[model samples]
Target: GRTTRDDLINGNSASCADVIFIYARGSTETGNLGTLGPSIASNLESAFGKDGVWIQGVGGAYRATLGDNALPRGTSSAAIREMLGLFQQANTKCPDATLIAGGYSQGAALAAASIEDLDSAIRDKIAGTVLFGYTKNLQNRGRIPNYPADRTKVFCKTGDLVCTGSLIVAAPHLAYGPDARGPAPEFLIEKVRAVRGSA
Candidate 1:
């Protein structure tokens, strides 16, 4: 809705920011283009502050009936490769910037995936990560697996109904969506501060 990568990276903007916060979709909802985009643009405005750029990744809950399912495909290594390609295509526009990724549900998964995809050099620049409604899905979730304790600072909910390791245990995946909105804003603050301390 605003600036393109070319425009922003080409020095059209007044000032350049040092960090970027990315949000990916969770579960089937990432497909909900109507709701997810606006919600993120609004919520992240407060959490990421005025300088941060919020980029949307491919992966939502609802897949379009007509076109190729882009985001969901990103769940695979191929998709991750494509994401890297896009990064290579535009990252030069915003040099000396740290990429901080976070998300709820599907977004959490993509954040983790992108984290894994980043090169060692890029990984070093990562400030922090915050995840809501985290789930391992096909990935391993055992003994310090998935959301490891070493680098990432994850804030999630735990409830009886939702899957294990979920930040808040909300039943029926769809319910997990709303739970993300609550602790998400606050969690983002703590995660950023954690970057200053350790992480």
Candidate 2:
């Protein structure tokens, strides 16, 4: 891969690595992983080592907005299926990889849903999880269901209605890239390393 950021997101399918970050990007963002994905991926690579980290953007038509909220109340239906398939493949293909799953906005909905829906076998492979502007939090729930609370980190800006349930898209909702450089990555690195440590 020439450009690590581009290749990681816009590039080919996932191969194998010590840590696999399977991400579901925000709605209407460019590329499959969206703009924020590269920030998170690069941070993971910087801390986890380039070769050891693998990034996979969820592949499917998981659109967002009122239509989706009206339907699934948060995430997209197709993203759920596709994410499950991806988790299954990663579990079998990457024997030693620690899977760090997460999502943004509607994608956060997908990540949270998968945490509840994934098979026990596959779910056990999850080293940690991250979420930004979680729509489900609007319902007064802030954590991803069935996932380890210690390994989960959610980023919610003060004025973001998406996570606050104000039903209005505000400026805060569009800004989450800085989180990539903060505790979010730190939380991911700690859990990911801790998981691998026991192995």
Per-residue lDDT of candidate 1, residues 1-199 (tens digit): 3311222323323365545555555544424222333343455556656566534344322232222223442245554554454344335555564555554454555556666666656666555555555554323341113334444645444452223633343555444444345544445455555665344
Clashes of each: 21, 0
Q: Which stretches of candidate 1 lie over 4 Å from their true place?
A: 1-15, 30-41, 59-74, 86-91, 104-106, 137-139, 142-172, 177-179, 193-199
The C-alpha RMSD in Å for every predicted model, in order, reads 6.2, 3.3
lDDT of 1: 0.46
Candidate 2 residue lDDT tens string, 114-134: 778898867888888889888
What is the Å distance of residue 75 in model 2 from its true position? Answer: 2.3
Error of 2 at 126 (Å): 1.2
Error of 1 at 66 (Å): 14
Which candidate has the highest lDDT of all? 2
